[PDB]
From a paper:
FMN-bound CpsUbiX crystallized in the orthorhombic space group (C2221) with 6 monomers in the asymmetric unit, while FMN-free CpsUbiX crystallized in the cubic space group (P23) with one molecule in the asymmetric unit. Electron density for FMN could be seen clearly in the subunit interface region of the complex crystal structure. FMN is bound to a positively charged groove in the subunit interface formed by three neighboring protomers. The FMN-binding site is surrounded by the α2 and α6 helices and the C-terminal loop region from another subunits. The C-terminal residue, Tyr204, forms a stacking interaction with FMN. The phosphate group of FMN forms three hydrogen bonds with Ser41, Ser106, and Thr109. The charged surface is more prominent in FMN-bound CpsUbiX.
The monomer structure adopts a typical Rossmann-fold topology comprising eight α-helices (residues 19–32, 42–52, 60–71, 89–91, 107–115, 121–132, 147–159, and 177–192) and six β-strands (residues 8–13, 35–40, 78–81, 99–103, 135–140, and 162–165). The monomeric structure of CpsUbiX is stabilized by two different patches of inter-subunit contacts, namely patches 1 and 2, to generate a dodecamer.
Residue numbers in the entry:
A (entry chain C): 4 to 204
B (entry chain E), D (entry chain F), F (entry chain D), G (entry chain F), H (entry chain A): 4 to 205
C (entry chain B), E (entry chain B): 3 to 205
Write the structure that this text describes.
């Protein structure tokens, strides 16, 4: 039925709207989503976009499914230590994962392999199985230690995508900036998108 | 007269509006500016914000002065390879410099000391004189080599400041995101500002 | 405001609680405003080494310390473990000076690697990225290689690693003289006038 | 329509024949090409194989179209700083690029992310977007610094393919050596080829 | 011989002279034989911090310390700055255990880089090459990056870097309790039974 | 009572002229100096400028005091093992130090933390206390090991300022070269100077 | 008598022609050669150029002597583990050695000092005695690990000369490409050559 | 009847009188010079020493020829992309090259192998052919990135010779400082000179 499974982690960086719009576009492209959200991520979603994701995985899954009028099974949320989840094992996990937005703290944890929660274990799995991990980092300025951590991940095939949208297409609202970034994630995932033209400059 | 001199370099990355908004605020704050603009810079300023900066330094100074209604000598623009500029010698150059927006290619030339034009020499000088260089890099995703370049400069005390505006202050307009970044540049320069509040997270 | 400056002070679970308590006292006497963070291992060490039970709840702690030091109104605010709605948590708002004292090798390690897992680690990461001044008063001996790798990294990046190794070359009558050696060094580095450690050097 | 788009950049290293043959094979394989040529590249093409690429991009597109009897829009040449080309942006650029032949100076510029012209930007974009870049470097001997540069690009997923043809197959004429290299580039690009058989050693 | 083992003990010009004096006392009580090296900056610190004037001449120093500690015959021998005809100077002859205490960052640096410019540095270089145990009780704060680079190098190569950062989690009534914390740690690392620092850990 | 205290060490590199003139300017700028001089530096001073610094510290202080017509307490010299000097401890030492001229050997001692004499300890101190250390290194050519040493210091915030005078100003005389280096030192110290003009290139 | 002694090692990389031509030129330049051939080298010589080097060292010396019409003692072949050869000891070995052609596996063994056979020992001896070793490597594309290995040898004064002939001179036949490489090796060895002219680019 | 060929590059660092005195001595020692001058190097010679080198290469050869009363073919100036020059190919280039004065931007370009112009290609070729490159760097203070660039090249056998003259030989005039540096260059190149004597320290 679905076109593929993608793991999506939302962490406590600023940039909630990116994550909300990415999920909208993935659902519309008819992907199945396994969604992980950190406790700080929930705080940011509430403050920035007024979105309150219930803390219980079941209620969260139903909440998101209604928000996006998604199909049966299309969205599943897994809790912070739910090791039964498919994402926890290289024997079962999807091969694509996006962290959006991705805090420098979560980026750091994945860089060093702390694997202390489901989001960090999932990322560690995608890296070991040689899949695709994309981290949409939101911070500025960067410190040298942020850069060392990004460098290490990028050398190992992780895609560091800072939330730094461009303005060279006609930018007429905040949405168009949001769609710049989301369209780049989607191009990287190998998913047809029409939210960001291919005109170039 | 003025609270100080700042060197501003505009290069060909997207995010012209940041640079225009930065000039606007430094003028109102009564700083004197030495502005440098690469060719690709002007092309970006043109297509993104409809601002055709003349490529002659003298006409460029008058245009910007007029555009910002600046005082006499408050803005001086210098040419691609105009070595008499005060920015080209450690004996004379200002100690604060911002490259906004900063292409990955200019970041790279600065990283490695290419010093091939006035912008690159000007940055090399601030670095050797132990001044403050701030580079507003606008590119995504980063490649590994981007990240090696950035890490090398950052270790050497250059502030890598990617154009990654935050959204926690409540954004209703693109101008709030522009002001997010410009306000961070101003904080770093030690310039009082009220375009981005000090509330933090509420 | 109404104060000379703002300082962020984090207490973590290394031995050396008496250095932290003396440092707060001197900073208050100097009329600085303090944002205090304290980890739970931190409170355990305070409790066992100097008998000071800081309430775990941030309002109650602010009051407790305020009364302890007879501090002015809003001079001391404690913030809790994940209280992100705290000015220390954002570069838009935070103090440019922070001291971790005593700093456990675990907190130093989490700062070194950027873990930013609680308010203490985030506040440090912010100070680092904003190019402020972070001082870490590490208390541990011996060092391992990995401790040294972590301290080295931080020191290359402009973080001041100040082990709690007091000197004895001044008048040492009491333990208080050694506490004051280290607190005197922190104050000098913070740019704060102090008379607890004379400037005579070696005689 | 076409089987895919490829970016080709010709630079000022010896080995113009490799490039001309590579174009011939991609045209016959029904690929669409975006061709970039450096000024040194043009001088090399001229002196080595008598091929004079018009200075004008439109004139060059037609000249090559005509030379290879290529279909409509199958060959588009772009100029030195034509930032409006598809190749300059990650939102638009092809995911495969070859630099044939590749001078050590252009390999250097790409290694360090200098991105000063369309070739180096095109490269940097391919690298950041995680596509495939192949560099047919021609120089001998190598210096340590050449090797450092190749090393870092290689670690970053760029294919350093020196123009070092082998002789273990049927070597009669120079064309067999040219075809050795071109066939290796075609195998890497994933394109069906029979100018170099798969017998291996015999 | 007639002793439990041989230990090389070097005193250098860092603050912390009272750690060295207490360490000799415990080693003597434990019936170890000591080869003592003392630098001239070392004697200056001993003199100013604890009032102990070790004669610069090796015979006179051996007698002075022997009497100070009421040591047995040949239990303490001091050796002078370039006294190469000393068993510490050759791998064919030297003790396999050495402590520098207090260890200045200058002596740590000369050992790190292999300078071997006097008997102290040579004796350390020997212990290192013979795969023995070298403990360095560094006293300095803050650390610089270059200090940390030097300590890191040494620690990777199996040298124990033991900063003089005493803990407070045990019963601390006096300064002597903090001196005994560090001396207790040196003894534990040397494999020497000691009761000056209890083994109760944290309560 | 002076504008501040600076530590200045004179070591056995050629360039005694630069040291003598820095001292002149710092005295006229009303700074208090603590001077250290190596026995090799004393030999260089005697042979190059015929200045004979006496060996005893008290006689040294008086000699330099006399020579510069300095005020009371303005110049104090300290001997090579004079650990009572305020420069020996982070609890008491000035936050600015210059080694002029600086031999490759003393730069090496400082690079590696040898801290063998007062000059080396004073530098070690300034570094660990995060002050400002400036090393006017005179040597040519550099070896690789000299460069490794300077790179290590520079990465750690020490200013490696080779005695490499420029000629773009009005160079009528040797003093013009001495003043180029001295002026650059004083700018780094944050001390107003007018011996080297602040227009750059002309 | 002879102008000097050179060690030549042939290994199992493609490019046997380069080696045969190199020998021809050194013989005509009156050098004395100590030749080593690996078993893979022999297989390559056979399949590429029909040259069957006798398995026996004495038979190989005569076979080559005869092939090049060389003088008495001008060519001595030595076997795989003939440690009694001059080439195996630093007390005796020639100070110039070429490995032509050089497989990436023998370049690897030399990079890491494996010294398992006469070729690798000969190499290691040349390197330790600070003579000149040249490695004509033939492989494409390069892997990262190939590049790491070449890098470390290059940093250590070994000449990595890939078999990447250029085409800027008069290219008519394959012999002109062979002569390009051989002439570069002869220039490095310091030996007068006219198979590759010095006109440079025209 | 020239003793040898030297490539001499003049770049945009201060110290033009070094380069002019170096050509004088090399012409008196009967060496043949191939001189390259960048556009920033012209500007420096014009302003510092009042020498205006014509922009076209033939007029510039004639100009310098007359200036030093050089012999027929003793001096040839080559333009910034005159790739037909002997210096641009390893097959033909001189084995000794001096960059004097050397900017930090030209030192960087050579460090990372940019090879963007004839000066940078010439250097890249001297390095790959294992000749001798000497870089007379004039800048102070150095930044960490300057030091990283120098270190890399020195590790690779390039001689980093900063323009840091000594004073231990009795210094009459500025000329004695110029002659200190030029004598060191000449000593490095292996050319007898009597402008800086050999008595060392007295
Ligand atoms: C409103 C808000 C916005 C934040 N924005 C960022 C940010 O943009 N970047 C960042 O690195 N941390 C940010 N933080 C801090 C992280 O939330 C903090 O480091 C937390 O420990 C992250 O936890 P997580 O990585 O488990 O999500 C923010 C916090 C809040 C409350
Ligand atoms: C509309 C437009 C937008 C561009 N945006 C970027 C950008 O966001 N980041 C970047 O690194 N380069 C960007 N480029 C490419 C640079 O302009 C190009 O690499 C050029 O060589 C920069 O030179 P400069 O650094 O001298 O300005 C852009 C070009 C155009 C035409
Ligand atoms: C009484 C006591 C003393 C401690 N002393 C130290 C110490 O001196 N150094 C250290 O690194 N950790 C010490 N610890 C361990 C830390 O408390 C432990 O590593 C903890 O996880 C640190 O957490 P924190 O960094 O969040 O405060 C001590 C613990 C206790 C209970
Ligand atoms: C006829 C000719 C042949 C050349 N061959 C080579 C070569 O094989 N390798 C190389 O690295 N450079 C070679 N060059 C030099 C490059 O052309 C030079 O470094 C130039 O600056 C490269 O510019 P580009 O990288 O923009 O093409 C050659 C030059 C000419 C004129
Ligand atoms: C009273 C006094 C206390 C000192 N304290 C220290 C210290 O605690 N740490 C340090 O590295 N050096 C200290 N020094 C400096 C060393 O004595 C100085 O670096 C000396 O050269 C060390 O020589 P040594 O390593 O040969 O003993 C002190 C000096 C004096 C006079
Ligand atoms: C006349 C003279 C000039 C010297 N010039 C230099 C110099 O320019 N650079 C240098 O590194 N060493 C120079 N030296 C050598 C240093 O003096 C020597 O290495 C000494 O050991 C350094 O001692 P110091 O670092 O304690 O002062 C010179 C020596 C003499 C006698
Ligand atoms: C016909 C033929 C051609 C070969 N060409 C190459 C080559 O060009 N490059 C290479 O690295 N190995 C090549 N090999 C593989 C090497 O022969 C192989 O790695 C062998 O183990 C090398 O042994 P040697 O290094 O002792 O000569 C070739 C093998 C054969 C049979
Ligand atoms: C009068 C004058 C003096 C200069 N001196 C120096 C210098 O001493 N060192 C330096 O690195 N750059 C110096 N520059 C800057 C270089 O000329 C500049 O970075 C230029 O881009 C170098 O280009 P080139 O390397 O192609 O010659 C100077 C410029 C002028 C106008």
């Amino acid at each position: 039925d679905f076109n593929g499974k993608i793991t999506l982690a939302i962490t406590g960086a600023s940039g909630a709207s990116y994550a909300m719009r990415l999920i909208e576009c993935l659902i519309a492209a008819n992907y199945q989503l396994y969604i992980l959200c950190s406790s700080a991520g929930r705080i940011v979603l509430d403050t920035e976009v007024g979105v309150k994701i219930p803390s219980s995985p079941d209620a969260a899954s139903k909440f998101l499914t209604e928000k996006y009028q998604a199909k049966d099974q299309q969205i599943t949320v897994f809790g912070k230590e739910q090791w039964f989840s498919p994402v926890a094992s290289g024997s079962s996990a999807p091969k694509q994962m996006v962290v959006c937005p991705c805090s420098t703290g979560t980026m750091a944890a994945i860089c060093h392999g702390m694997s202390d929660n489901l989001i960090e274990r999932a990322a560690d799995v995608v890296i070991k199985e040689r899949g695709q991990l994309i981290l949409m980092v939101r911070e500025t300025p960067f410190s040298t230690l942020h850069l060392q951590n990004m460098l290490s991940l990028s050398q190992q095939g992780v895609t560091i995508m800072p939330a730094s949208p461009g303005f060279y297409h006609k930018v007429e609202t905040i949405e168009d900036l949001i769609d710049f970034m989301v369209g780049r994630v989607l191009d990287h995932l190998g998913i047809e998108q029409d939210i960001m033209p291919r005109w170039g400059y």
